[PDB]
Assembly symmetry: D2
Amino acid sequence: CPLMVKVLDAVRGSPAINVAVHVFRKAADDTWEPFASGKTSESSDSHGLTTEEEFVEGIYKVEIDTKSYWKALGISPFHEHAEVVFTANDSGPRRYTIAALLSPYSYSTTAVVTNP
Amino acid sequence: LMVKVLDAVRGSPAINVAVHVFRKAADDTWEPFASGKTSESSDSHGLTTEEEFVEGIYKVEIDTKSYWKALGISPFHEHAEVVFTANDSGPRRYTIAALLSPYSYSTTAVVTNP
Amino acid sequence: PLMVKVLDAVRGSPAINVAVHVFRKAADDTWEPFASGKTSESSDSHGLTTEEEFVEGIYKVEIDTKSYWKALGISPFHEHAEVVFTANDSGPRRYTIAALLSPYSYSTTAVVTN
Amino acid sequence: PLMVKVLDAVRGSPAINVAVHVFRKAADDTWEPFASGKTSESSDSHGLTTEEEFVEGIYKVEIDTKSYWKALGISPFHEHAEVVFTANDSGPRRYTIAALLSPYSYSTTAVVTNP
């Protein structure tokens, strides 16, 4: 797939399941146009959310509802959410894996961009 | 509110990194609050503003793109953000530690009791 | 059963032809080879996968990160990257060890399932 | 010349009283002890203060992360966290080793400055 979003819980060492993910595209005038939306689930290596649509050139935003993940576990976390804002600047076809590693007071975000 | 930024490509503090700050408006839009850029002097590896930080959802934007570009690297992210609620239980002491590579970053909050 | 992912944080790609050696602990400062090989990017499996199943115990994963960076004219801080951990304390599990490499930094994460 | 700083990414605080053991490689390729410390938080110095003078050679810093997490009732993934590195290879440097800890994850970074 052209986009893979993985969200990991670094305290449990597991995919963070039932996490809301919202992907957007920069529009003129600052507007963000919704591109994909979904919730994490698991089976095999696919412990994240995949879109089928490829990424033409632009600026994207991935929002991750990490506040609702922790609040479910009895934890009010530092971050109000995780956000990943990036350029898709190879105009030709690229694969994007975006991983978010979650703790109550920390997050980490990593991208892998490959050309198939 | 202290913001410390480390460069994982160079093994150094991230020198001359732009750090902006926002306070949440009623209009769901973000009202500015402060700016700053990380200054390496004596012992300080980060940008510390001189604020009287009240309660409310605050935003920290780090300009990682301009930082990596100026070093001839085409980074992944536009920037690295921390959105958090600052003083929901009296005064608190905040260090945001950010660690930066062209394709990844982590932000950690260190909350001490003043 | 064991997957090791090695990622280049500078380039945002799998770090390929990286040597990985896995060991089982045999006694004080004694390590038995468990499996080994090199990272290879075959699309979606970008890391090293081993057929061998874990029996209960302590395992060491050695990643030759220093060769990887030297082949790039970079003299990294770390001589290698090592992950030591206990396996199968509770039964038959799938382990994915990810290492994210930067010249002055490495970070390691583990996902353990079923 | 050698400083080791530890952050707890679960509790959002310095990791206080984590043990740090530093070894030096020997001409027979073994690990001879070098520096002994648990991490301390007095003032805003949130790490471990190693005093000894650094020569050219290979060093191993071991952070006992398992003891740390077991004391908060968490069974962590890792047995420990180590950094191995060649120090002082181009002359006297100052090392700050920064460790960030969660139970199934950790990172180490070096801040390397010229005195």
